[PDB]
Amino acid sequence: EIIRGVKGKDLLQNNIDYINRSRSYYVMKIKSNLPSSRWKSDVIRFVHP
Amino acid sequence: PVNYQLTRTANAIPEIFVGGTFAEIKQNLIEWLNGQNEFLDYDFEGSRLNVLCDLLAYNTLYIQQFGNAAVYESFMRTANLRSSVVQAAQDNGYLPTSKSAAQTEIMLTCTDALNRNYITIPRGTRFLAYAKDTSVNPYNFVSREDVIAIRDKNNQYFPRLKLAQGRIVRTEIIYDKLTPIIIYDKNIDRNQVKLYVDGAEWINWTRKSMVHAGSTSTIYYMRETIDGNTEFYFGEGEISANYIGGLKPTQNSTIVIEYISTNGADANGAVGFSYADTLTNITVININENPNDDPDFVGADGGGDPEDIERIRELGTIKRETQQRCVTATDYDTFVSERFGSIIQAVQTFTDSTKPGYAFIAAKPKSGLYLTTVQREDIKNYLKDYNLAPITPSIISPNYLFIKTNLKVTYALNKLQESEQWLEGQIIDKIDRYYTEDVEIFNSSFAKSKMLTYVDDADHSVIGSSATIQMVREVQNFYKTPEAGIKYNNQIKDRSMESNTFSFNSGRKVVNPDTGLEEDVLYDVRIVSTDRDSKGIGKVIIGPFASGDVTENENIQPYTGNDFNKLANSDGRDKYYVIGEINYPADVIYWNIAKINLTSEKFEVQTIELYSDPTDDVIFTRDGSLIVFENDLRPQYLTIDLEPISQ
């Protein structure tokens, strides 16, 4: 049981079901602008593990 | 493009260098000589003051090469002449593996008369191996490292070790600090070297087997000094270390280098080894198992010979993207490379999203097919030291798609010399050279027309050629196939995807003549993918069945009809059982024999070929699946007809 929690982030409606949706797990979200097909080649090769 | 600002350019030698065609030089000089300056007052003549112009133009066109070539081999991407290339690749931290030696791991069954526990097996332990082309002559082998054994139960040892090709040589030298210590011989794999300085150790720098966090000084350096003869030297240190650098010798020392002679790449054969062991009571019991690991084995691997110019460059610049560390998919490809290379032809490392960590590495050895083990575990360790700490590298090996040719070269009897055989083999490597050059690597397709133009290039007498073709892709576990796996990536040309062999067991007893009985191991089976239908459909069948063993129930009722689903040739009594899907348009195969619910024990060995023929002539590739043909290992499918012509 948790007491003395904290509020980290919103993501609108809060449900353990919705908060997962499809669980990302350890995937990383590049989450910047762009069509995503221009950089996707260049993030691999020069960046990223 | 769209916006003109994106034109830029690739690597471009500017118009400043380039260099003369001659007469254009004559043009520019005349305009500079006659015009803008003199308006000739020249005292030579009407013709001479003209003629003498090109007399100094040959002086230009000369000095425009002799001195202008330097800037070509000053840079890397534009240079020619190895020497400059190599020498400029060490400041990028590379070195080009001047040669290489074969390596295996053999497990010696030997034993000692003294029965003493913890028998050793010191460094050299000279062996010899035929590396078979026929039989005659050995080469040599040396273990080069240590190991240990253990006595258990019956008195025997299993001192399994690994061994390199050449012998060894040790030249001790006094360090003058004015004397650039070197070797001069055409040899000496830089991968395996020791170089003690008078005490021990000296683990150097450029190549770590450990990396020994901290440890400061005692490093040394190995580069080139062109000429093919390797340079050793030491840092700027003092040790009165002072601050940072190499420990350096002190003005006089015994510097003991030991390398491996490395006879050459001719030794790839391996196979049978002999003891040739004289140490102490060790009997050298033999029963030497060259490949005690795993599936199919080619013999030794490596052997090197110096890397080509077109190789170095690509690996020379990319190692500026890295600094001695692999954080990136393209880094593992550079770390599985001439460092650990010559044992791996191509890589394409990738990471699977569903499974975190676990960087996956596909690799094809030059020996072909699978890396076996301990040549895999070796690639494991050398990475994980430079790797990104939590994630573990793993060698999956690619998913191989071979192709079955059945081609006929139809030469002419008139113009030959060595006739058949020698031409039978001369057509092999030309085909093999086609793979190694174009389609050996990933993402590249092949065209049978391009294979035939290397076929027709055999010598002369061969005129014309042609082939059928089948794409062969062999399943590993069989009995199931993975989930949404086993895909060609090409259009399958329905009424294809033909079986292999199989077999059965059980079927009651069925005793035979002579001895007591048998298990009824005859009466094989095999799979056929039938037709197309309204859209994909098509099903597939497990194969011929007589009667008896199955579970019929309500869910099976074996039949496709006397329609397509072509028949295996035996008694076999038809009654083909439906098994799996095989959607044609998006290439997919699905089996799961458990549908008809038989026992896996009723089947013989797994790892069966299937090999549908392609629709289109050209065979594509994707998802890290190579198309590479290697003959020497598996002859099973290559068949060629020399059917001749008399004029």
Add this chain to the structure above:
Amino acid sequence: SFAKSKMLTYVDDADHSVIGSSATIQMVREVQNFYKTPEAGIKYNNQIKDR
């Protein structure tokens, strides 16, 4: 003689990437004066398949 593979090296050399090609050949000899044939003839070598 006309070799399928010897033409396919020139059609392969057309432009930088044709990524290879394939073909199937039909042998055809047009003969004037049908209805008869010259009592021996229409002989094209390299025996053709059935039907």
Add this chain to the structure above:
Amino acid sequence: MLFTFFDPIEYAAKTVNKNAPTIPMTDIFRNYKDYFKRALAGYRLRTYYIKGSPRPEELANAIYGNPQLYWVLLMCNDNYDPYYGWITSQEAAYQASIQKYKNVGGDQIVYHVNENGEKFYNLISYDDNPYVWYDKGDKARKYPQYEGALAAVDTYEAAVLENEKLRQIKIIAKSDINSFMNDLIRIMEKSY
């Protein structure tokens, strides 16, 4: 022939204009300068000739050597530029001065040379003003440098001062050169 000594090789130049013709070329890519360096070991204490004459580029046929060798003088000073490396005729530097500054600034004053030789570089006096020097910027003054006094070297003098300090060289003494060159070959034939 103490250059060359090997072969034309062939210079492919294939990285530019593929299928370029191979042109036999005197071989200048050996890293010669190292051979000289290592071979020289033991012949050292080559004295300091001090030059003393605007000897044209080749004094080899006068002082040590003299098969018009035109080098072993080079390898001495590790000369990067065979033209402006050696000292030049006094006027040449002057001639060299103009073409250097001809584009911008005209003739100038490069530094003001305190006695004891402390250079200053874009430090400027004001006559009819305080006698203390100032930088060429911050014209509000307020930030003086070098309260003392010194004398500017303008430009011509500098180039003279700079090239004239370039006359000292090693020799090999006209004694060793034969024994030396007799070694310098041996190292070369050694590596092949």
